[PDB]
Curated annotation (Swiss-Prot), chains B, J:
<keyword id="KW-0647">Proteasome</keyword>
<comment type="subunit">
    <text>The 26S proteasome consists of a 20S proteasome core and two 19S regulatory subunits. The 20S proteasome core is composed of 28 subunits that are arranged in four stacked rings, resulting in a barrel-shaped structure. The two end rings are each formed by seven alpha subunits, and the two central rings are each formed by seven beta subunits. The catalytic chamber with the active sites is on the inside of the barrel.</text>
</comment>
<keyword id="KW-0539">Nucleus</keyword>
<comment type="function">
    <text>The proteasome degrades poly-ubiquitinated proteins in the cytoplasm and in the nucleus. It is essential for the regulated turnover of proteins and for the removal of misfolded proteins. The proteasome is a multicatalytic proteinase complex that is characterized by its ability to cleave peptides with Arg, Phe, Tyr, Leu, and Glu adjacent to the leaving group at neutral or slightly basic pH. It has an ATP-dependent proteolytic activity. PRE3 and PRE4 are necessary for the peptidyl-glutamyl-peptide-hydrolyzing activity.</text>
</comment>
<dbReference type="Pfam" id="PF00227">
    <property type="entry name" value="Proteasome"/>
</dbReference>
From Swiss-Prot, chain C:
<comment type="similarity">
    <text>Belongs to the peptidase T1B family.</text>
</comment>
<dbReference type="GO" id="GO:0019774">
    <property type="term" value="C:proteasome core complex, beta-subunit complex"/>
</dbReference>
<keyword id="KW-0963">Cytoplasm</keyword>
<dbReference type="InterPro" id="IPR000243">
    <property type="entry name" value="Pept_T1A_subB"/>
</dbReference>
<dbReference type="GO" id="GO:0043161">
    <property type="term" value="P:proteasome-mediated ubiquitin-dependent protein catabolic process"/>
</dbReference>
From Swiss-Prot, chain E:
<keyword id="KW-0539">Nucleus</keyword>
<dbReference type="GO" id="GO:0005829">
    <property type="term" value="C:cytosol"/>
</dbReference>
<comment type="function">
    <text>Non-catalytic component of the proteasome which degrades poly-ubiquitinated proteins in the cytoplasm and in the nucleus. It is essential for the regulated turnover of proteins and for the removal of misfolded proteins. The proteasome is a multicatalytic proteinase complex that is characterized by its ability to cleave peptides with Arg, Phe, Tyr, Leu, and Glu adjacent to the leaving group at neutral or slightly basic pH. It has an ATP-dependent proteolytic activity. PRE3 and PRE4 are necessary for the peptidyl-glutamyl-peptide-hydrolyzing activity.</text>
</comment>
<dbReference type="InterPro" id="IPR023333">
    <property type="entry name" value="Proteasome_suB-type"/>
</dbReference>
<dbReference type="InterPro" id="IPR029055">
    <property type="entry name" value="Ntn_hydrolases_N"/>
</dbReference>
UniProtKB/Swiss-Prot annotation, chain H:
<comment type="function">
    <text>The proteasome degrades poly-ubiquitinated proteins in the cytoplasm and in the nucleus. It is essential for the regulated turnover of proteins and for the removal of misfolded proteins. The proteasome is a multicatalytic proteinase complex that is characterized by its ability to cleave peptides with Arg, Phe, Tyr, Leu, and Glu adjacent to the leaving group at neutral or slightly basic pH. It has an ATP-dependent proteolytic activity.</text>
</comment>
<feature type="modified residue" description="Phosphothreonine">
    <location>
        <position position="58"/>
    </location>
</feature>
<protein>
    <recommendedName>
        <fullName>Proteasome subunit alpha type-4</fullName>
    </recommendedName>
</protein>
<comment type="subunit">
    <text>The 26S proteasome consists of a 20S proteasome core and two 19S regulatory subunits. The 20S proteasome core is composed of 28 subunits that are arranged in four stacked rings, resulting in a barrel-shaped structure. The two end rings are each formed by seven alpha subunits, and the two central rings are each formed by seven beta subunits. The catalytic chamber with the active sites is on the inside of the barrel. Interacts with CIC1.</text>
</comment>
<comment type="similarity">
    <text>Belongs to the peptidase T1A family.</text>
</comment>
């Protein structure tokens, strides 16, 4: 029987700072035990300072990104070139996903950008459109490896103030873009070591009020 | 079934056994698997009797309506109509058809259409359950530009072997000769072909 | 796994990668897939990890006893016969796929064994999930009358093909050279082309970060 | 999930947890499982996250359209029935929802409706919904009286979610409290179980099963 | 929901400094029966694109007709059909990719793996894959079926990343492709010895080579192999 | 079968076990005692597959009684629980495993302490202040997490148990026909007749 | 009905400078229902420590079995078993049940008393030895533990620093797993002193 | 389907078919509604050119839409039945979804909406 | 859902319907009224698939109320029962059939007679002196076969009904949380509050 | 697999391709499917590689023990031992074996043993997946009492065709000649046999 779904592997990761947000993803694309491409980008600039990735089944991922990009285009046409805010993008993507509730897009979707107060924003979606704003989210094959590390290093979970008898928590603070990129790079090298579908390269898209910047780093190719 | 069509110097000859089965019971031992879709465009039928009949009937209708408007259709055109039906209804068909015709411009032509509905133009084609047993023999013995008598002998010897090994095949060997001269029907009985 | 075996002038060489997986997760980044059956008979094993180890140890044990009984150096065909009959008996349920090689009084030998108990003979062989990548290299560069150093190069190149192209294989290349008239030389981590890069950050925690409820001394003495 | 809502002397208490799971994977610890439909209406979410989220925000849009057309806030009965009739149309298609529509109107007073994805619609004083519902019931039923003070009712709702968060593997994160009065709903904070458990253990003397 | 009947095996390809090379054998398999030997599985579109197709052959022939029609339709009311408004490899791919994903979404796929190789109008190399699932990807080397497992490792030794492409000549590239075809003939049980190869160069254009044969094979060592273990004669 | 509960307090272990035996759409009995005395200060309650339950219980009972006669001595509750666990751990890989879940309430006379062990059919043993098998736990554990204190009297334990039965009688789908309650302490095993 | 994920639980081991650490959670459940928050998964036979995740009945059975076997070892050998030797015994014992295995994920940790070398090892349910310089992970949050360890770990940590690293590895891994947590224990092991610490963690 | 736009604007901005429909109302028997402090009374004229009528069975001029709302009319009798039927169906539908009977304003708004729809739909008068 | 009973006596039809709504291992409600008044002298009780039951009941209710307003007249119990049967008979061959079983108790004012109709989800209609749906019938039918007389008073019918509920409370596996009892006679429909 | 054994004037010749597969991957392209169970009693193996090897090994052991006690076994005896193993273990075997040997009394003899474990003594035998395609050819071309060179050509041409059509078959054509003179091994490479 024909199976309309496949698994293209890879993993993605979104972190939000005070005045920026990053959306990272490895560039490896796979089926079964074969590598299809060492450099196939799956993090995209969608316009209006919104970056997006739909990781899982690449055909669905590409279809969704394609539809959302088109949605941004028509939002301008219909509402006098108004900028699509990240919260409005999130709600729109929910309807894109839930519209195929009974034949889902097989993807974990993350978008990143800035909210209407200029602060960094990350939104994450399940395959059928349940969404939530967070400081932090990993998606895809190695999400289970990376996410607990992010809980510990971004949100300071299980970390108490030394000498306080485990009574005072380590206080929450925004991270600098330098600190965030260090965590992204360590997250992906760790994932690459222990997950076979993760490797080859890492492409990070950084979003500030000035626009979208890219950074690339080599990952292990085995 | 064991069926085949072979091009030669003067045109093309089609050949077939006469056995129709349901399991191991021979429902018809004198079947005619060589079917006219036009004056000088014929086909060999294999697979489901019902499917191949229904297809051949539709094709014959299409070519009759073609002829009314545009004159004699090419053998390629006939094969395309067969393909269109077999390809678009591949989920609901079990039909392996060999199309064979004679043009005066193109002479003899053979097109085979397997289960999927793909088209393949060949010098000769074999099909049906019994064809498996004569791939070796036919490849070794076929020559291009054979005479009528040589081509008749090639088909006779080939189908004889296909019939000998395939339980689904048997009865008489029917043949249809397509040339500029016209249409000739040949029949060969067990007592002749079995002892070849 | 990727594993290979290559015959040369005066003996035989086998090689293997060092990755061990559990689904998409790398369980062991530096596991030893080269097994000693006797001093000069060695086995490369793919398939179920515990099976290749256990079947190699059992036959190795019995080969040692046989060697002591007969006052003779063990032969590769004996290890081959004993392994194949054991594996056949278990109808494939012991998932050991082995490349058996070595030197003995009869000469130098190279064989492969399937989990169901069938055996091959050849000058070059490869088994495991990366065997197609390896065999592609072997079929491209193998020739009759290889030298020792040529055969090692070919064998490790064939393993590298698996390391880079097969997600089932990774990390390092192990080699074992069995030459007639000499001691077998096991080359553990002959190539290490997958060293982890320096991490961006030290994640050493301030002492006292972890909240503690109780402490106690554990008695290990009598 | 664990969610609950009950009625007492002083309105309605509504409490929920905040955990999302995918099998044994803890996906989120910060999910909003209460949706604020209007200043007098609340909706609770259990089952499929998308199903609940999508259709309950859709419900909010239908409630807004009612008050535009009828120049009057929708009744809790009519709001709940919009949702129940919607999911009944999809019956068999595989929607997964256990919801509670809670609110106050003049004609009804404080009202709670249970609505689930196989089309069940029930008016009631107490309901607990989700994989941890039984754990919440155990504590809630054994301490419930109609005459609870606003202060005590808030604690009991909070304590019942904590009970389920602790025992049910698929419940946890934090507790979100709400109080519904004649004047509308009032939010009573997000309470992380990380701190709340130890605070309750120490002050209440309960949870003796746990290593102190 | 389908099942493939008459099938074509691997299609292999790679980028070199000035263009792309693509190859596929001339076999139409019918299960284990190697049924048809004159099957051309590389189809040129214009003078700048070659589409290589594996999988179901009836569906391949359907795709041929679609591409043929695309050329006809593009020429309509188009004075620049053989100039600025000629079909680009990227247009041909996106069209096929759209069709492939639409068909999988209707649960009635075209049972194929497709590689579109060509050169864009600005001289850039184009090489991209699409299959029955609508999955698309690009890489300096691309291959389908057994080619993915055996050709890619060999072709990646020549071009392992983007920077290797300018350093690779058409002679070196073709040599690697031809070698990979031989390896596939050794090891793929549904491969034939006869194959076609196409080069799309930004300077010399489209070169289509038919009736190529695998040669310089090693079989002599077979005479020395006796038995399966202990047999000596 | 169905409902078996256990509460360990300061000086005693209290076991409550449902009285119903239901087969199909008929409650065949409403006074069934789902317990066996293994030794003077050790009581075992049981729930699970029909036939298996009593067969296992009586088999364990016979073995402990045999031990008692042989050594002229009573095994500790810990020792008995370990013996029972091992029998179930053997059973789970047999041709036909015992599908029986048990609670063992005992008073260790050497330690002067009550002890409650929860053991499932797999042979999963845990010592607990309060225990339950089946769906009962889904209501009682959270209830006991709230109201239980480690220093309670036998009377307080019985009131705590009444609270559990009341909750089960309110929220459980099936009519389990009340419970038989038994107390295990320094003076042995006795049955509360009015519950 | 997957035997390795009915009860839940995790174990992790790490090596430091002249020391080893082995840690485990305290949960025992029946699928969604938490049953016990006192179920320790680490045992020791002399100076050799063994942690076992998976089906709790098999955890208990194997502990009892290895206590049995190491006691007889000591009586006959007149010395305590070493980590390397015990690792082999665990492997043999598990493979003995090749086609009817114990559903467990054992982890050996300890210091060889002759050489002074820290030693850790892991096994699959049927005996495959997984030796490591750095860390071994096991249980229902093994993915999470792999991610935590691979990023947090650095070589040659001091006992007090190693405690912080292994604790943070376990805690944050456990909190992303529904079936793991409900308390935690960490063992810090030096050549001739062992310290056992219970960690404060969220109880949901 | 019959599509003709029968209700259209004339040069002076009138829709004659709607205005001629008012003439039909002007021809109908008189109907009056008066509301008191605690009641509403509906009075209806019945023409007396019809003797030999059976008043038991002859359609009454005032119709119950629900147990709490009534409808009287002036104009074409056959036309009114269609409006009354639709109103009665909407009355039950409202009780079904809103769990409360219609307000008189709502029921009126519905009936008026139906009437309006027949002034800019093709093929209807 | 689960238990719905009906008894037709001399001058009235009495319907008894269980109060429990159970989902999974939780009794979500113990005061559920599994009945709808179709007309002043016609009452319908219902049991079956969740959602389907109330949806069907209210749909029938709306249709009968629509008829009542249109004709200024009350349909006979026989006429209503035939309408209901046909709706279910349609339903059973739909894409998704209503899985609802009903009892219709009515007082025909033209005949001055009580009438009880039992209709299952297939559209199988029968007029009966006493009726039941589901497993209830397996106990009540034989009981009523013995104790029922055709000339009983409403009070005698209620005592006869008490006997049924008592038997069900003794032998049924599930706790159905008692019944709501309603009487249909010449004066319409009223509810007995103390049962 | 395509395998065959053919009796002729001076004895018997066995023939085989060299392809072993797992699906469509060629695990071994230089396999030796012609196996010695005694000095001048050999077999062609088809079906499961593991099964046919295990059987051949047991048979070779049995005939070695036979020879130790009773001298050289007959070809019939060797076939009987193969049969006994194949018949009694039919539920657990996938082995199609052709047994061929040379006696001085009986000259060349061929026995074929299909899946069920039945025995059939024939002038020549063909087996394996590729045999299906040469039933026609072999029946038409086989003659009794052929010469060595004629029999070599018959097997070469036959296996060439079997290899051409069967995807499971390929590589080299191995042959073993069994005569009074001794045992001769022949090999034929693609470049020769493909263009026949
Ligand atoms: Mg790799
Ligand atoms: Mg049909
Ligand atoms: Mg025949
Ligand atoms: Mg929890």
């Amino acid at each position: 029987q024909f199976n309309p779904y496949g698994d293209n592997g890879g993993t993605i990761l979104g972190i939000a700072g005070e005045d920026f947000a990053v959306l990272a993803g490895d560039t490896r694309n796979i089926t079964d035990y074969s590598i299809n491409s060492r450099y196939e980008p799956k993090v995209f600039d969608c316009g209006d300072n919104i970056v997006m990735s739909a990781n899982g089944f690449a055909a669905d991922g590409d279809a969704l990104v394609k539809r959302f990009k088109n949605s941004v285009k028509w939002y301008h046409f219909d509402h006098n070139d108004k900028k699509l805010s990240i919260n409005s993008a999130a709600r729109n993507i929910q309807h894109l996903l839930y519209g195929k509730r009974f034949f889902p897009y097989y993807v974990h979707t993350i978008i990143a950008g800035l909210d209407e107060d200029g602060k960094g924003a990350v939104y994450s979606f399940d395959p059928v459109g349940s969404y939530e704003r967070e400081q932090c989210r990993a998606g895809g094959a190695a999400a289970s490896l990376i996410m607990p590390f992010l809980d510990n290093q971004v949100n300071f979970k299980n970390q108490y103030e030394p000498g306080t008898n485990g009574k005072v928590k380590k206080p929450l603070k925004y991270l600098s873009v330098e600190e965030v990129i260090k965590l992204v790079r360590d997250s992906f090298t760790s994932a690459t070591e222990r997950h076979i579908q993760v490797g080859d390269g890492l492409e990070i898209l950084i979003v500030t009020k000035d626009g979208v910047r890219k950074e690339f780093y080599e990952l292990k190719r085995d | 079934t064991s069926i085949m069509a072979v091009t030669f110097k003067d045109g093309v000859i089609l050949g077939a056994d006469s056995r129709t089965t349901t399991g191991a019971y021979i429902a018809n031992r004198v079947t005619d698997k060589l079917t006219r879709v036009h004056d000088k465009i014929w086909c060999c039928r294999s697979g489901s009797a019902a499917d191949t009949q229904a297809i051949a009937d539709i094709v014959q209708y299409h070519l009759e309506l073609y002829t009314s408007q545009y004159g004699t259709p090419s053998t390629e055109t006939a094969a395309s109509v067969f393909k269109e039906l077999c390809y678009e209804n591949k989920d609901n068909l079990t039909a392996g058809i060999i199309v064979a015709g004679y043009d005066d411009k193109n002479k003899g032509e053979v097109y085979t259409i397997p289960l999927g509905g793909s088209v393949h133009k060949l010098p000769y084609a074999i099909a049906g359950s019994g064809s498996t047993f004569i791939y070796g023999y036919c490849d070794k013995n076929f020559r291009e530009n054979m005479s009528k008598e040589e081509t008749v002998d090639f088909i006779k010897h080939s189908l004889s072997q296909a019939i000998k090994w395939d339980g689904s095949s048997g009865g008489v060997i029917r043949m249809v000769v397509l040339t500029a001269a016209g249409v000739e029907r040949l029949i060969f009985y067990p007592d002749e072909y079995e002892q070849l | 796994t990727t594993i290979v075996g290559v015959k040369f002038n005066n003996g035989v060489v086998i090689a293997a990668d060092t990755r061990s997986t559990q689904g998409p997760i790398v369980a062991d980044k530096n596991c030893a897939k080269l097994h000693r059956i006797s001093p000069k008979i060695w086995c490369a094993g793919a398939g179920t990890a515990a099976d290749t180890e256990a079947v190699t140890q059992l036959i190795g044990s019995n080969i040692e006893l046989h060697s002591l009984y007969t006052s003779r150096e063990p032969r590769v065909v004996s290890a081959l016969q004993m392994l194949k009959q054991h594996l056949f008996k278990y109808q494939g349920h012991i998932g050991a796929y082995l490349i058996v090689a070595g030197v003995d009084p009869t000469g130098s030998h190279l064989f492969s064994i399937d989990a169901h108990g069938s055996t091959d003979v050849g000058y070059y062989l490869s088994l495991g999930s990366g065997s197609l990548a390896a065999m592609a290299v072997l079929e491209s560069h193998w020739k009759q009358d290889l030298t020792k150093e040529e055969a090692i190069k070919l064998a490790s190149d064939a393993i590298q093909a698996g390391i880079w192209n097969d997600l089932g294989s990774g990390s390092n290349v192990d080699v074992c050279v069995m030459e007639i008239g000499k001691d077998a030389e096991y080359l553990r981590n002959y190539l290490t082309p997958n060293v982890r890069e320096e991490k961006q950050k030290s994640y050493k925690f301030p002492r006292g970060t972890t909240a503690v409820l109780k402490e106690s001394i554990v008695n290990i003495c009598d | 999930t664990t969610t609950l809502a009950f009625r007492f002397q002083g309105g309605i208490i509504v409490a929920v947890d905040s955990r999302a799971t995918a099998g044994n994977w803890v996906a989120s610890q910060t999910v909003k499982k209460v949706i604020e439909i209007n200043p007098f209406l609340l909706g609770t979410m259990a089952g499929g996250a998308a199903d609940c989220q999508f259709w309950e925000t859709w419900l909010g849009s239908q409630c807004r359209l009612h008050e535009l057309r009828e120049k009057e806030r929708i009744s809790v009965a009519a709001a709940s029935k919009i949702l129940s009739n919607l999911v009944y149309q999809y019956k068999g298609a595989g929607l997964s929802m256990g919801t509670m529509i809670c609110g106050y109107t003049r004609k009804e007073g404080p009202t709670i409706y249970y609505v689930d994805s196989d089309g069940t619609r029930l008016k009631g004083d107490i309901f607990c919904v989700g994989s941890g519902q039984t754990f919440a019931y155990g504590v809630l039923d054994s301490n419930y009286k109609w005459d609870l003070s606003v202060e005590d009712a808030l604690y009991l709702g909070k304590r019942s979610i904590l009970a389920a968060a602790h025992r049910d593997a698929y419940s946890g994160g934090s507790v979100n409290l709400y109080h519904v009065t004649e004047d509308g709903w009032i939010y009573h904070g997000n309470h992380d179980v990380g701190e709340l458990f130890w605070k309750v253990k120490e002050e209440e003397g309960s949870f003796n099963n746990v290593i102190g | 929901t389908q099942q493939p009947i008459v099938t074509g095996t691997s299609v292999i390809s790679m980028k070199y400094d000035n263009g792309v090379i693509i190859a596929a054998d001339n076999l139409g398999s019918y299960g284990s029966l190697l049924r048809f030997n004159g099957v051309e599985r590389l189809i040129p579109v214009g003078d700048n694109t070659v589409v290589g197709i594996s999988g179901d052959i009836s569906d391949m022939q359907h795709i041929e007709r679609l591409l043929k029609d695309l050329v006809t339709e593009n020429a309509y009311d188009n004075p620049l059909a053989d100039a600025e408004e000629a079909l680009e490899p990227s247009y041909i791919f996106e069209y096929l990719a759209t069709v492939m994903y639409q068909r999988r979404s209707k649960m009635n796929p075209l049972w194929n793996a497709i590689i579109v190789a060509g050169v864009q109008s600005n001289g850039d190399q184009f090489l991209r894959y699409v299959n029955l699932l609508g999955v698309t990807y690009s890489s300096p080397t691309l291959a389908t079926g057994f080619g993915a497992h055996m050709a890619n490792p060999l072709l990646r030794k020549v071009v392992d990343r983007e920077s290797d492409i300018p350093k690779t000549t058409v002679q070196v590239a073709e040599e690697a492709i031809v070698n990979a075809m031989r390896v596939l003939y050794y090891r793929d049980a549904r491969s034939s010895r006869n194959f076609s190869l196409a080069i799309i160069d930004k300077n010399t254009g489209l070169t289509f080579k038919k009736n190529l044969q695998v040669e310089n094979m090693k079989w002599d060592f077979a005479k020395d192999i006796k038995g399966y273990g202990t047999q000596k004669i | 079968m169905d409902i078996i509960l256990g509460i360990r307090v300061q000086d005693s272990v209290i076991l409550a076990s449902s009285k119903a035996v239901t087969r199909g759409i008929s409650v065949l009995k409403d006074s069934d005692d789902k317990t066996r005395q293994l030794s003077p200060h050790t009581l075992m309650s049981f729930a699970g597959e029909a036939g298996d339950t009593v067969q296992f219980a009586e088999y364990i009972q016979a073995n402990i009684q045999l031990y008692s006669i042989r050594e002229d001595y009573e095994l500790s509750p810990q020792a008995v629980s370990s013996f029972v666990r091992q029998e179930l751990a053997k059973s789970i890989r047999s041709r036909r495993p015992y599908q029986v879940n048990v609670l063992i309430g005992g008073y260790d006379k050497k330690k002067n302490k009550p002890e409650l062990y929860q053991i499932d059919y797999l042979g999963t043993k845990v010592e607990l202040p309060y225990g339950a098998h089946g769906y009962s736990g889904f209501y009682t554990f959270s209830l006991l997490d709230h109201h239980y204190r480690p220093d309670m009297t036998t009377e307080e334990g019985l009131d705590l148990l009444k609270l559990c039965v009341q909750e089960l009688e309110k929220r459980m789908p099936m009519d389990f026909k009340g419970v038989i309650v038994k107390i295990v302490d320094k003076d042995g095993i006795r049955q509360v007749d009015d519950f | 009905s997957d035997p390795s994920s009915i009860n839940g639980g995790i174990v992790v081991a790490m090596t430091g400078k002249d020391c080893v650490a082995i840690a485990c959670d305290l949960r025992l459940g029946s699928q969604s229902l938490g049953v016990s928050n006192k179920f320790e998964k680490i045992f020791h036979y002399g100076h050799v420590f063994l942690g076992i995740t998976g089906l709790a009945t098999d955890v208990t059975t194997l502990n009892e079995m290895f206590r049995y076997k190491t006691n007889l070892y000591k009586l006959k050998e007149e010395r305590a078993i070493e980590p390397e030797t015990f690792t082999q015994l665990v492997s043999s014992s598990l493979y003995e049940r090749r086609f009817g295995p114990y559903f467990v994920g054992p982890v050996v940790a300890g210091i060889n008393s002759k050489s002074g070398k820290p030693f850790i090892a892991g096994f699959d349910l049927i005996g495959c030895i997984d030796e490591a310089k750095d860390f071994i992970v096991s249980g229902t949050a093994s993915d999470q533990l792999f991610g935590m360890c691979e990023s947090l770990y650095e070589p040659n940590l001091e006992p007090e620093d190693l405690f912080e690293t292994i604790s943070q590895a376990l805690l944050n891994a456990a909190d992303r797993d529904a079936l793991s947590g409900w308390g935690a224990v960490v063992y810090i092991i030096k050549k001739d002193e062992v310290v056992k610490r219970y960690l404060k963690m969220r109880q949901d | 389907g019959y599509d003709r736009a029968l209700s259209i604007f004339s040069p002076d901005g009138h829709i004659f078919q709607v205005e001629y429909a008012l003439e039909a109302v002007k021809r109908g028997t008189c109907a009056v509604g008066v509301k008191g402090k605690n009641c509403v009374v509906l009075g209806c004229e019945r023409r007396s050119t019809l003797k030999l009528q059976d008043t038991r069975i002859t359609p009454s001029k005032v119709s119950k839409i629900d147990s709490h709302v009534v409808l009287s009319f002036s104009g074409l009798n056959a036309d009114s039945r269609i409006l009354i039927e639709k109103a009665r169906v909407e009355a039950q539908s409202h009780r079904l979804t809103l769990e409360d009977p219609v307000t008189v304003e709502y029921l009126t708004r519905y009936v008026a909406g139906v009437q309006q729809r027949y002034t800019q739909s093709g093929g209807v008068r």
